[PDB]
Amino acid sequence: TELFPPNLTRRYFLYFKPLSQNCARRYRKKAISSKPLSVRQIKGDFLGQLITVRGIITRVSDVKPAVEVIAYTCDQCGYEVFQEVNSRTFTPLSECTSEECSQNQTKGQLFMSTRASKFSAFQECKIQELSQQVPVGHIPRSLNIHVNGTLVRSLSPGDIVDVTGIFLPAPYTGFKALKAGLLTETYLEAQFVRQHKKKFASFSLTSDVEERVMELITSGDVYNRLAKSIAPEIYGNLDVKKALLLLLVGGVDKRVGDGMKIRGDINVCLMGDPGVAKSQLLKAICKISPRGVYTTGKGSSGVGLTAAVMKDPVTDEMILEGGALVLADNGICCIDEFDKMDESDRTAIHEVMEQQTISISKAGINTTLNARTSIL
Amino acid sequence: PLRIIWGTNVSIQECTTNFRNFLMSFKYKFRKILDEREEFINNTTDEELYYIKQLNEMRELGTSNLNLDARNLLAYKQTEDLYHQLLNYPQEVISIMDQTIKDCMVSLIVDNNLDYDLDEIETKFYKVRPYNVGSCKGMRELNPNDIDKLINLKGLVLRSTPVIPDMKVAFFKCNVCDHTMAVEIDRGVIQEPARCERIDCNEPNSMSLIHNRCSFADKQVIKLQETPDFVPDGQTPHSISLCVYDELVDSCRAGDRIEVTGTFRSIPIRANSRQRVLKSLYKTYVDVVHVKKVSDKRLDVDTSTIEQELMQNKVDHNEVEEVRQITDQDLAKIREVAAREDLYSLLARSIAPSIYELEDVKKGILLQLFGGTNKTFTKGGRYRGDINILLCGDPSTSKSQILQYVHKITPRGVYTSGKGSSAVGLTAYITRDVDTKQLVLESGALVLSDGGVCCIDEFDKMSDSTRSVLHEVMEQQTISIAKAGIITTLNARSSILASANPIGSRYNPNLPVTENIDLPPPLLSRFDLVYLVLDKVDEKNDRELAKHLTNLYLEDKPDDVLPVEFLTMYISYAKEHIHPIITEAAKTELVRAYVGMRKMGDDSEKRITATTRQLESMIRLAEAHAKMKLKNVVELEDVQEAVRLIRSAIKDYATDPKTGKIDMNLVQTG
Amino acid sequence: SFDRPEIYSAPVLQGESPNDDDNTEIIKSFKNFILEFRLDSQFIYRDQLRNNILVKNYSLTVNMEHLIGYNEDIYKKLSDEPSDIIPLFETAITQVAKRISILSRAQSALNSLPTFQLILNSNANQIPLRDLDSEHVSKIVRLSGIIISTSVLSSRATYLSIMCRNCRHTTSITINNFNSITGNTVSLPRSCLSTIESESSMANKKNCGPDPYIIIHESSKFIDQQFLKLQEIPELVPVGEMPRNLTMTCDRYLTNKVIPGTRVTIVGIYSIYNSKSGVAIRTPYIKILGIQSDVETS
Amino acid sequence: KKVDDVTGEKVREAFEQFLEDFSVQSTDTGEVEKVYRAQIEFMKIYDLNTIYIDYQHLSMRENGALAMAISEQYYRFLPFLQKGLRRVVRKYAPELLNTERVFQISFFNLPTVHRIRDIRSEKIGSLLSISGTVTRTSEVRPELYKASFTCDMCRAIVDNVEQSFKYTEPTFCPNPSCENRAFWTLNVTRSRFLDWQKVRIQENANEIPTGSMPRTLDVILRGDSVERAKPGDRCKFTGVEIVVPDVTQLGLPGVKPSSTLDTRGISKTTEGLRSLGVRDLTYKISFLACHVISIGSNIGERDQEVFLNSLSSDEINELKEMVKDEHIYDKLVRSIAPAVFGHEAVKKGILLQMLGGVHKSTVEGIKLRGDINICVVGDPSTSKSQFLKYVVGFAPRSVYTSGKASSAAGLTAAVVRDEEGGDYTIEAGALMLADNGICCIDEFDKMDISDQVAIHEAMEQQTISIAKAGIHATLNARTSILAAANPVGGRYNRKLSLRGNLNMTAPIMSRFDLFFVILDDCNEKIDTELASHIVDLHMKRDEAIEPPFSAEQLRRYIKYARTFKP
Ligand SMILES: Nc1ncnc2c1ncn2[C@@H]1O[C@H](COP(=O)(O)OP(=O)(O)OP(O)(O)=S)[C@@H](O)[C@H]1O
Ligand SMILES: Nc1ncnc2c1ncn2[C@@H]1O[C@H](COP(=O)(O)OP(=O)(O)OP(O)(O)=S)[C@@H](O)[C@H]1O
Ligand SMILES: Nc1ncnc2c1ncn2[C@@H]1O[C@H](COP(=O)(O)OP(=O)(O)OP(O)(O)=S)[C@@H](O)[C@H]1O
Ligand SMILES: [Mg+2]
Ligand SMILES: [Mg+2]
Ligand SMILES: [Mg+2]
Ligand SMILES: [Zn+2]
Ligand SMILES: [Zn+2]
Ligand SMILES: [Zn+2]
Ligand SMILES: [Zn+2]
């Protein structure tokens, strides 16, 4: 008899969490999977292995249904025919291939059914080499990450992450003349993600968090202790650091039943003589905050602040790609050299600072977009 | 035992019985007690049979579409499972529901022995349109397991394709014997006959399809810009394709905000035109079942802009409502509220309850929402009662909040910012469509906001070239484009509400009004109302304002004001049914006021002299004030109120006519 | 560097109603005839199939007049067009035998089971050799005569594993039809099948050439084919005429069952071949389905 | 034998009976005359290929069933209409048949005209009327009507094979030599062709919905209807809604219909040595117009003898009555823009602009411009835009453009890429659409300097040069220019000169014949009557306007006066 195979009756996704370095130290085990590699160090001899890469996420595609096996129904025999798909393209089955139509002289016609076919939630992400990982005089390199199943939407642009996955080859993309032999593209099929900075929305009152919170409370003097420990290599500036801590926390977001909104985010300007280490304070805050984006007055242009309409080729559609303010959404935008900015960026932050939106009406686009940044 | 469609949990017989019992036995009091609304239960609306009444009126008007609120299914006890089956399996459940509607249609006339003929009912095809199927989840938050499920999306329509013929029956003719057959499409596939079916003629490859003899159905693709309730971290707005079919084609225009409910579909896309190889990554879209264009929170569309569209809606029999229905009791309430002596103050006070005072600004905003009467000449001329308002002010004057409220309250306006917009992005442009790789025409912000209010924040910061676009919009309510793609005249009947700051970012009493506003006279003359919103520091005013802002944060969720639903429907009724005309007593005092302010302009730029557009603005504001009080004539007191609002908006009483300066203490009352 | 996608099916719905001319229904009717036929009180064909599997004789001997007693329509189909119906009954025998070849050896304490051979005997009217006609072409004929020559056994391929010359694509061909004479009705493919299949994702203009496949003989399987010559009996021959004869082909268990000089009845298909005397003339021959020795020499 | 269409046969008999039996009573006398026999005997004189049939006349027949059957299934019943017309012509005028002459039936005067957005899929194959603005027109081209082929191995000639839209080849081959049906070749010389033109039309301005962009439609003209459509005018097309294959819809969402060949009655063998062909069913709606009529672009031929013959005698009497008036000039200058109060000099200039001057050429070849260019400058709200809006509404072949919304290619002519296909096209700009007319450019100061360069190239040269990509062309730009400008700073400065107030280029300023500076001066009396006039307009709509001449008779007088060459 013919059964539905176990691939067609599985409701679960299976992932491999890497063994920790600390647990590997106990048993004198040397873990290749635990050690975070840079993008440069992932060579061809790591293919097929479970490896961990640390880096900043630059681009994340939208979640799309990638078909793993296609289901067809035949009216002639009543069978359901399934064809697996493991490539970017497939040829659909036209004429029926069950055992009943194969022996019969009249073969049935297959009609594909979406609901009986199996799909995976699919995302393609780019991870970039971190600045400390890049050697001297080099440009950071990038790696493709394939995200399937439950792990989708766990990667966002701008996150510094440890992505553990299986390093796998892909069919060659590029000009045919340039290829020499059995050249392959590479990607990382993601298995596990650990965030270097934990998001505030992802916070949950787990048991282990509670004792640390109670310890910090029972130590007492929490406000001054947290403020003075923000940038401790900077001497003094206690009130500045207190306002920076209030910047990190912020007030409550106010919603009126009429729909009118009053922002809970605090905006802080630090203006002073050169050499007061306020750039150091911005970098300290802006590494502390999980969604902190550091910008320069003229290094960040207008299109690098708001948005740009660009084509995404993996999902094959034109999408809006955010600037620095979108990257710092529900975070802190870290604007150094504030007086050096041009007037267009000043209008952009002028709309951002109160309405928490950016309204763009150009030839490319007619949108409003959420920019809920607290601005330092 | 129990027969179940493969891949579902749906039994056809059980679903038919449950839905028929729901149709026969549902009352709206079940919906009220579901929503925990016990005090709002009344007898004459609830205890009557609801869907029986709609079936009766649907037979009487001859319509074929039934609008089903899916929340009502969850209200009824027996159809609680049917709600989840409709969400999970709309393709089978909707067909079952259509069959049940047809059965109830024939049963209502057989049982009551009505004079309606059974044959006319039987030939009709009845279909139900479910809506309010759940929360408007983000479209990008949907997973592949949500394919072929019913979903809700809020969105803004950017553009739509022309009507596409989708083949349903294919017509084949034999080349040798002229024998014709018609084959009906099966799941997107038409089987060509290899040989002629006639006993006399059996020539292979002799059946040729005739493209114009065969029948087609209407299919339209609309690009919708989603506006979800919840937006995650760092998400940019995205546009989704939605497909409408048959009567729903061309129901949605560009620039309107709609509630779409439909099934979440995915298809594979051919990688090449010549090849049959498909791409493994699927393309997602929504097959639209129902469109809602009416919100109780905001106003409805101005019907003078869609008269031909309403006629074509009646021709197409789409049975989609652009306007909310006005019942007799709420119309009586509208007539009773219009009889109040404090109607102007009550309506202006109920505009923005969160915004404290700004009474004259709120009065001007309310008159802009009402608008003047629209006059179309039989010769061909057109006069529009669109009121343009400028709010020039100091920082912290709630004018951004006012533009936000107006943007929320209008049916189809657009909110833009200074230096966030360009001249091309305001009028119209050419883009490349992702699906077709074609050059497609797309409306700019001003054309999208036609029939509504275009709000422009930071108007003073906008460039000269971009502000020079607004001249034709403000005076003729249209834009005359002569570019490579289009040479045409586009209607932009959008009232403009602009917000601005002075040059020094704060009002300087040393400089005159014109220097503080810093607008060219051609642009500033086109504004009907110019508001100088000033910050005067007082004990009582600052105390009251501080108390007003601090009462907001007493609780987590915060005189007498009208509710926003009643406000919107009252303004809607007044715009739809009141078209006031100018009388002799209004005409003479309009002329006297215009002559008087021209005489005031004789004195020695420093001051904004009176202009003919100010006479036009007096006419429009008087018509708006007459339309507010439901009066069909403009008489003297409405014109005096228009003149008073014009004087008080720019604070003409506070300023010195000779110098043009404004002194803060000697007249001003905050 | 990915593997093949897999195509597989599972029965879900009832489908269209079965048709008598469909191959599956004919196979099912043949299977029911094998399982349920009673001669006097015993299932003779089922027990015969079990005994043949025990002796490792992969063939079934079926009396044709029993098919009269069981079901007329499939007898008519077998008589009118045997070339399409005989593979179906052989498939039915092979399908029943698989149930016997699993449920027996695993209980009375890898194995590959070939397609069984249909041997069928008839007691009906015997056509004389010179009364054969064009109306008998491609139909089962029962006829009598004397065998004057038996050839040596030739080796035909049933299963052969082939490999592309330079491409090294590996393929297998299974042959269950050996009825043809002077013809390779099944042969090696004219071009490599790796490109049209597109089984691998990499797919590393490359053309392997005409006839690129090579037979791997150590993994190929073969059977025996024999040529016989049947002559009309010399007792009834016209005086001035040379006696007329026919070339016949037998395979597998039908070979080496008769010596020259034996008078036989033969059930077989009156068939056609072209030998390279008339623009369109074909030489007749018989594909032997059953041999009956009228008398047995000692 | 072929099977016939019985409903088509009844349609043929009813239509051929209609071609004789229909009659009307004479207006002048009351004689019973039958208009379509008169039509056929008139075409027999002048060798016309086209018969014009009124739709109301066909609708009068029977109870209206014939008109409904013809309109609903026009594509199906059209060959029956052709056969009926051929038989009726054979009965009366057999000489028309000989040169075989291809006959075309043009229907007109349909009861309703449909908008370009009212086009739906249920009307495909039906007679219908649409209206639209012609934006692009193509070269007259030959279309393969009746092809001639030779079989490749027979090599005998066959002819008169009908073509059903896309190119077809015969599979019959009545020559007994071959046994192959598919293989043929086509010769272009012996083939018979028809005239073909594709004209692109656009939604009219008043027909456009509230926020939508205008959408276009490609309508095909054949036979005598070719070249009756011109870019920039409003045309009413009567014809059949057809459907055209479209490969564009490949990436669109939704299930696209496909067409497989059915394999149920084919006997097969697995002898060995499984490919089948499937074709896409993706289409777009087009129009095939049998009749073209050009509605006036306005809301409401150089020789005067040609012009007076078109007018009836009663209207010629009214024209000569207007000519006979001694105060005709005062009536004309008061009839220009009655919504505007005052400004008699601007009305004089606008009237002279509409009349224009004569175009003269020297022996050297230098052309003297007869067009008069007017520029109106002044203080804000001096009714400058009212003049331009009146001119574009009243004057024929007139376009209204804004300075900011215009572009250099949008004003003169643009080379356009279509569907990313290798062909390039030219679409006429604003000055070409207003050729021998007036181009109204509002907000002239706001226009870009490069656009000013691109327009005064046409202002001296009276022509537009195209050298972009592979298209080189010289186009006519014989247009008058009515411009409205605002001075620098908004208000007109009395202290400065005209060049100081205007930001426009000096080559722009030199070509303007008249500069009308309208100043705003606040006087009590003039403001009083102006305010009274404006409020009376708002109060009384059309009847507050009292011109000496209506728009139609003013336009008739201007069209008469343009024929004179002083
Ligand atoms: N209070 C402080 N404590 C510790 N280091 C300090 C302090 N003030 C200045 N510095 C050091 O002095 C240098 C000043 O660097 P910056 O952070 O660039 O100062 P700055 O305020 O940004 O000056 P700019 O960029 O010219 S406005 C750094 O090396 C700081 O570490
Ligand atoms: N009169 C007022 N009534 C109520 N709330 C007020 C008032 N004035 C200020 N606020 C509050 O203060 C905030 C200041 O924002 P806005 O007044 O909207 O800024 P603005 O008036 O647009 O001036 P800008 O941004 O400098 S042009 C508002 O969001 C309110 O919460
Ligand atoms: N003399 C006039 N007669 C009639 N209406 C007038 C007159 N002067 C001004 N108006 C009206 O005042 C308004 C001015 O509109 P426009 O014609 O656009 O002014 P304009 O002269 O074009 O000045 P700009 O450059 O547009 S600011 C319109 O409503 C006119 O109908
Ligand atoms: Mg610094
Ligand atoms: Mg603001
Ligand atoms: Mg103007
Ligand atoms: Zn099948
Ligand atoms: Zn036929
Ligand atoms: Zn090979
Ligand atoms: Zn031939």
Residue numbers in the entry:
A (entry chain G): 189 to 564
B (entry chain D): 176 to 733, 739 to 784, 788 to 853
C (entry chain 5): 2 to 110, 129 to 223, 233 to 304, 319 to 340
D (entry chain F): 101 to 199, 260 to 433, 441 to 467, 498 to 763
Task: Please quote the paper that reports this structure.
Based on the occupancy of the two symmetrical DDK binding sites on the DH and the general stability of DDK (stable DDK vs stable Dbf4-NTD), the particles of these two subsets could be divided into six groups, representing major compositional and conformational populations of DH-DDK assemblies in the reaction. Groups IV and V, showing one DDK bound to the DH, account for 44.5% of the total particles; whereas Group VI (11.3%) represents DHs without DDK bound. Consistent with previous data that the DH structures with or without DNA bound appeared almost identical, our structures, at much-improved resolution, confirmed that DDK binding and phoporylation did not induce obvious structural changes to the DH.
The Dbf4-dependent kinase Cdc7 (DDK) regulates DNA replication initiation by phosphorylation of the MCM double hexamer (MCM-DH) to promote helicase activation. At early G1 phase, when the DDK (Dbf4-dependent Cdc7 kinase) and S-CDK (S-cyclin dependent kinase) kinase activities are low, the origin recognition complex (ORC) together with Cdc6 and Cdt1 load the Mcm2-7 helicases onto origin DNA to form an inactive MCM double hexamer (DH) encircling dsDNA to license replication. During this process, DDK and S-CDK, act in concert with various origin-firing factors to convert the DH into two active Cdc45-Mcm2-7-GINS (CMG) helicases which then serve as scaffolds for the assembly of bidirectional replisomes. Compelling evidence in budding yeast has also shown that the essential role of DDK in DNA replication is to relieve an inhibitory effect imposed on replication initiation from the N-terminal serine/threonine-rich domain (NSD) of Mcm4 (residues 74-174), as NSD deletion can bypass DDK function.
